[PDB]
Scaffold this motif. Sequence first.
Motif, short mmCIF file in Angstrom:
data_model
loop_
_atom_site.label_atom_id
_atom_site.label_comp_id
_atom_site.label_asym_id
_atom_site.label_seq_id
_atom_site.Cartn_x
_atom_site.Cartn_y
_atom_site.Cartn_z
N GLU A 34 -26.44 -15.00 42.46
CA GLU A 34 -25.80 -15.46 41.02
C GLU A 34 -26.68 -15.73 39.94
O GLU A 34 -26.19 -15.06 38.73
CB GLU A 34 -24.63 -16.46 41.49
N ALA A 35 -27.41 -16.67 40.04
CA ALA A 35 -28.24 -17.15 38.89
C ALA A 35 -29.43 -16.00 38.72
O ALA A 35 -29.93 -15.98 37.46
CB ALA A 35 -28.99 -18.30 39.49
N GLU A 37 -28.25 -13.13 38.20
CA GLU A 37 -27.82 -12.29 37.08
C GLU A 37 -28.24 -12.62 35.56
O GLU A 37 -27.78 -11.81 34.73
CB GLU A 37 -26.23 -12.26 37.47
N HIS A 38 -28.59 -13.96 35.67
CA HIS A 38 -28.97 -14.57 34.29
C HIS A 38 -30.42 -14.39 34.03
O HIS A 38 -30.92 -14.72 33.06
CB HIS A 38 -28.51 -16.01 34.22
N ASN A 44 -34.67 -20.64 34.82
CA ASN A 44 -33.26 -20.66 35.44
C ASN A 44 -33.10 -21.76 36.36
O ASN A 44 -33.55 -21.87 37.51
CB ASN A 44 -33.04 -19.47 36.22
N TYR A 47 -31.24 -21.38 39.31
CA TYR A 47 -31.86 -20.44 40.46
C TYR A 47 -32.95 -21.45 41.21
O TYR A 47 -33.12 -21.15 42.26
CB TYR A 47 -32.60 -19.30 39.65
#
Length: 151
Positions: A34-35, A37-38, A44, A47
């Motif tokens: 998920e993290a 994707e950023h 992050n 993350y």
Amino acid sequence: QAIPMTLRGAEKLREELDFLKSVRRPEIIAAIAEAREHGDLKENAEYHAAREQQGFCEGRIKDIEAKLSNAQVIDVTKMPNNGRVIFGATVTVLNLDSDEEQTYRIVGDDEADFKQNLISVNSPIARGLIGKEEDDVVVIVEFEVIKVEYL
């Protein structure tokens, strides 16, 4: 190098290995997917918190596997009560001086929780009692072993 562990405690260890392996592990890797994707992984936060947890929880897994890889699982429920304190027994002790009466359960290190009256075999109180029997007074001060129950 056989390592004594009670049935309650081992079922608790085996319980855990599953939740960590089957529930939390996935949850942690999806958190990271998920993290990711950023991007900007360096900064992050989600993350780094997820990767943090991964080490946290994976170590617990590596640990439980080992712990359970070494175990010698004792079930005192299956032995005739001699009245002698063995590893796994439940023991009522009386502090002959203060008259402080407590009941404890002798257990292994992973299961040990003295606040919950579960004492690790590797403790001064388990040590002074192990091998005694109801009535034996033990100068560990002195406590009297009031009752030995295999539960």
